[PDB]
Every structure is written in structure tokens, then in C-alpha cells.
């Protein structure tokens, strides 16, 4: 039945994840974080923002989660070592609701994949998932997914495109169905934005077009997070202010906030609001551009009071 926010570098930081939950996503994946950064990290409870932060040696917050999403956030790591991957899982397993391993390079070596994943399943008590592209040959694709399954992972997400297949090329619902059918564990359909998904109801269509257990949406949610809302799309302005509010409440860095709003604006980047956003050099300026200066001064004061 599940609507899932797909993992997305830069986009899937905490504000977007909360925003996606508000509009009706059941599960939110975070951006890919690399094991080699995460293993340098320290877990720190931030009583000011009421978040759990994981901080790097240069004092940067690498990953930030919070109570509202603790039963729904899936942590995705990029990794090519089973011992390193377990170490990262151990660091976060208490503050997250699942561990995902990216595979779209790693996809080449099935042995390494098998090692990493079984180490995680035996290693943590959270549902281990993974996300793959499809192989150029269907026989191999089917072989791959079956090896991956017996490692005891909770589910698998299939981006129905082959490595080095450009996004313009249609997603192959047919292979995702093949996969979904063969395996005993849930399959998560992925790859259907723009082509199949422009409106909420399109998601269940895609579910059926692929026989999958659920649907994982990226670009469509990046363009308008209210794509998870069954009642229909919200006006982009309303969504963007909602986004900014979260971003200010959780002290998001303004370059990240700006990046996400640009992905939302797109064509409308040439409106005066868009030009103001492009030009912003701080969160204050981002809020000004959307009539949220009041909100910014008010929320900043409560936060800087520790
Ligand atoms: C901005 C952006 C960043 C992405 N970052 C990641 C990432 O960190 N991890 C990942 O597994 N896939 C990443 N993806 C790919 C998506 O998760 C997904 O495979 C694909 O976009 C699904 O197709 P769809 O957009 O049609 O739903 C990214 C996609 C976009 C648009
Ligand atoms: Cl309305």
C-alpha cells in the first residue's frame, strides 16, 4: 500500500523528508551518505533543535534525524566494504527505521554485494534494503535479484533502467514485474517519474503496471512534494513556504535549502521570486524572498537562546 520517498543526494535532507511525510509518504529514504564519512562521525543529541545529529571531525552535521520520522526514515549508505558498512549501521541503527545500500559499480560484483548485505542482516536488527538498477540481460538480472534475496534483506527496490541508460529512455515496467513475481520479498517499483507519474493516482497505476508491492518516487517528489497527497497537488507557493519553514526550524544550511527550492521552481526561476532566491546569500534572504522574514526572526530568536 506504501508510498515511499526515494533516496536523493542533496534533496533528501531532513526538511524534504519531513515535508514528504506531511503530504502522505509512508517511508522516507535519506540521501546517499558515504561510509567513509559516516565512520568519522560522532552521535550527538541536539536538545536545541530536538534532533539526533551525526557530526564529522570538521564539526559539520553529516546526517540529521528527529523524532517525527524515527519510525519512517531509511538510512542509505554508499559502501564497498562489509566491515565499514556494519560500522555505519551500528552508528545509526538506533535513530532510524531501516538501512539501505546503494547499488547504482558495486552492482558488478555479486560476491561483494552478498557479503555486505548478509553482514548487515546478521549485523543489525533493522530491515536491510537495497536499491539496484537492472542488468542489460534479463537472465542475469533475475539471477542477481535471487542471490540478493536469500541474504535475508527485507526488500529490494528496482530502478527499471540499465546502468548507463539515460533517464529520457522509458522505464521497463516489464522487467520490474518479472522481478516482483520471482521474489518472495517485497519489490519496490522505481523509475516512473514524468513518464508515468505526474499526479497522485498515477502511482497506484505504476504499482499495477509493475506488479510491485509499493512505489518509490524521486523526481516527481523533488518537483512537488505534495505528489504524495491523494486529494491532489498543492500550489507550488504553498509547498515552498512549507519547505522553508522546516528548513529554518531544523537549521538546514541555506545552500541546501536554496538548491531544493530551485529544483522546485525550475521554469519559474525567472520570476522575481526566483531571481531573489538565486541571489540569496543566507536563510534570512531566502525567507525574505518568500515573505517569511517575520517567521525567520521569530524562530531564530528562540533557537539562538539555546
Ligand atoms: C537529484 C537526485 C539525486 C539522486 N540521488 C540519489 C541517491 O543519493 N541515491 C540513490 O539511490 N538514487 C539517487 N537518485 C536516483 C533516484 O533515487 C531514482 O533512482 C530515480 O530518480 C527514480 O526515477 P524517478 O525519478 O522517475 O522516480 C537521485 C536522483 C535525483 C533526481
Ligand atoms: Cl485549494
Author numbering: 12 to 115, 129 to 330
Quote the study's own text.
The genes encoding dihydrouridine synthases (Dus) have been identified in yeast Saccharomyces cerevisiae and Escherichia coli. These enzymes are homologous to dihydroorotate dehydrogenases and dihydropyrimidine dehydrogenases and they use a flavin mononucleotide (FMN) to catalyze hydride transfer from NAD(P)H to the uridine substrate. The human enzyme conserves the ‘bona fide’ Dus domain that spans the first 330 amino acids, while a presumably unstructured linker (residues 331–367) connects the latter to an unprecedented double-stranded RNA binding domain (dsRBD) formed by residues 368 to 433. Using biochemical analysis and structural characterization, we here show that HsDus2 uses a unique strategy for binding and modifying its tRNA substrate. In contrast to other Dus proteins, HsDus2 has a dsRBD, which is the primary tRNA binding site.
HsDus2dusD crystallized in the space group I222 with one molecule in the asymmetric unit.The structure confirmed the monomeric state of the domain observed by gel filtration. The structure of HsDus2dusD is organized into two distinct sub-domains. The N-terminal region consists of a α8/β11 TIM barrel fold, in which a central barrel composed of eight parallel beta strands is surrounded by 8 alpha helices. As expected for flavoenzymes with α/β barrels, a well-defined electron density, assigned to the redox FMN cofactor, lies at the center of the β barrel structure close to the C-terminal end of barrel-forming strands with the re-face of the isoalloxazine ring oriented towards the barrel. Remarkably, the TIM barrel core diverges from the classical α8/β8 fold because three additional β strands inserted between Lys53 and Thr76 form a new antiparallel β sheet (β3−β5), a feature not observed in the other Dus structures. The helical sub-domain is formed by a 5-helix bundle that caps the top of the FMN binding site, while it is composed of four helices in the other known Dus structures. A consequence of this additional helix is that the C-terminus borne by helix α13 points toward the opposite direction compared to the other Dus, thereby orienting the dsRDB domain. Remarkably, this domain displays a less positively charged surface of the helical sub-domain of HsDus2 compared to its known Dus counterparts, which could explain why HsDus2dusD exhibit a weak tRNA binding. In contrast to other structurally characterized Dus proteins, in which the isoalloxazine ring is planar, the electron density of the FMN cofactor in HsDus2dusD revealed a ‘butterfly’ bending at the N(5)–N(10) hinge, with the concave side corresponding to the re-face of the ring. Since the oxidized flavin ring system is widely described to be planar, while bending along the N(5)–N(10) axis occurs only upon reduction of the isoalloxazine ring, the FMN cofactor of HsDus2dusD was likely reduced by the X-ray beam during data collection.
